[PDB]
Symmetry: C3
Subunit: 226 residues, 3 copies
């Protein structure tokens, strides 16, 4: 029941208790620049290196910009793209500041291709909900995700709280099997990221509640010790 | 007791129930062009990426042709060749002349080097039998393979049934721990491969009986997803 | 329990019983040119490929020379260096001047960066002790290593017995959880390394006591057959 994300360069696998449980819905919630995307990227790279397939749906980067970003963190994924191991889905209308309102959530729920992979990542699910133009609500979306995670797949969304009402956020949080909140904070001269695991159903072992890190060129996530 | 063949790009590991059991003798039987070789190639690449060693004995491709063929599927194995992780054995006399005759089976049974690896592939064992010139028979060869798989090694052979009488094929099939039959078929005017698992002793878990695939440039085996989530 | 060192190209993992136990202190003791370094290099490459992190502290090679040496063995570690997965520490004063003297052992015990990794390699610990100018003695160093291995880390040191008195060597040996002695010997006019496992606490399974190898271009450690299947 544990999906592995192990890399030589960090011990994030130990701090989440060994791996990510199959059937997890992970919500990563935090404001801009608090490290949500990089976290998704580290997790995606971990999975892909451990022979899992990943769908990565980005409301922010074209395929090109993603390849550069991953390459910049030394999480390069060119071979994985070529084989289809990594299915990257740029949401052009949200990338392009035309930003048009659309049945995003219907598309998300109805595109079979995404869910053939082991792991499906929506960075940002908050932008997709906030720009949806339909009677599909969040309870429906959450129910749908629960159905997919019941197949032992893993879903990971980022949420920026500043672009959704509290009413909606509270529902996403309840649905989460794993809820992580990201922030920035400063100690000594240093800005750092903190990822706090507010909730972790099926927690596969003892895990660290507060994970401090920084994002480093040509490393990615550098986790700070203890 | 399970040898892993996992790759990111497909879920073939799930469909064979998790992996290939140690001590397996896998027979892949089908006519020309039904995908036997590509299947051996996918398995070999999986084993190698999961830190197993492989010997691949080919009656069809020189080393050069093999490297290209592996590269064409994006199963490139250059580094594995250089380290000796992959030992590739072209059978030149059959490659140079389809019907050249010789003590192929004696060579197969006697070359130590092949059996130092975890997995040994003969593509085609049917060509090596059909062109053997000796008193070594199939029962002897099978008994020898059984002796090697008893050491926890894995052996994989392809068989073209056009090359051997039914009397012989029946023996091989009996000896197989895993028997897979390949064919081509067309649905929606598209041509596809089917690998059907007719027998699977020591099946390590629930597995798919019919595995449909197509061979795709720079992917290799694209396995058709049978269920829609 | 078991740290994996598996590579497709050899079966070292089977000969050490499956892997290296977490919390091991491995001492590799032998004279110059008996293969201690190459063995550390094989182990380091094994760990790195199996998703552990490694610190490699060398009294002999600059970073550049290490990259060339690794590349020469087909154990190339360029990407692991760039990510910090591999932290390589050249001890410049010993590299630049064979017998320069200093508080080496203070620097070793104090530098927290080294011990953030899963596996820490000192090649050579005997040079660092022999040229230390401090109070610090071997029992202290051993006690410090024991504390770190109690955190499930693995520590690996090479020892040239020509550099230290027998009094200090006997302490390191009794303190080792895994003790391996290396020598050269010649068979068929060919010179080979032998690594003998004199002691193996927490041995995770059946293991081979004698491991013969030669160092081969683009292979590294080429382990010889124990047994012919």
């Amino acid at each position: 029941e544990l999906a592995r994300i192990d890399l030589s360069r960090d011990d994030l696998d130990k701090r989440i208790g060994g791996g990510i449980p199959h059937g997890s819905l992970i919500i990563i919630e935090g404001e801009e620049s608090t490290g949500k995307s990089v976290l998704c990227q580290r997790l995606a790279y971990g999975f892909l290196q451990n022979r899992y397939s990943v769908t990565y749906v980005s409301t922010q980067l074209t395929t090109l910009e993603f390849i550069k970003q991953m390459n910049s963190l030394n999480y390069s994924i060119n071979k994985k793209l070529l084989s289809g191991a990594l299915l990257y889905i740029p949401v052009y209308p949200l990338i392009a500041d035309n930003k048009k309102k659309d049945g995003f959530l219907k598309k998300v729920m109805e595109t079979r291709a995404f869910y053939e992979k082991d792991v499906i990542i929506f960075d940002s699910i908050s932008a997709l909900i906030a720009n949806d133009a339909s009677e599909v609500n969040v309870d429906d979306l959450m129910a749908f995700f629960k159905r997919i995670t019941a197949l032992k797949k893993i879903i990971i969304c980022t949420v920026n709280p500043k672009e959704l009402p509290e009413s909606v956020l509270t529902i996403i949080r309840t649905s989460a099997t794993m809820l992580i909140r990201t922030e920035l904070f400063t100690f000594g001269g240093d800005l750092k990221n903190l990822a706090k695991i507010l909730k972790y159903n099926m927690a596969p072992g003892s895990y660290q509640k507060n994970i401090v890190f920084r994002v480093e060129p040509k490393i990615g996530i550098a986790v700070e010790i203890a």
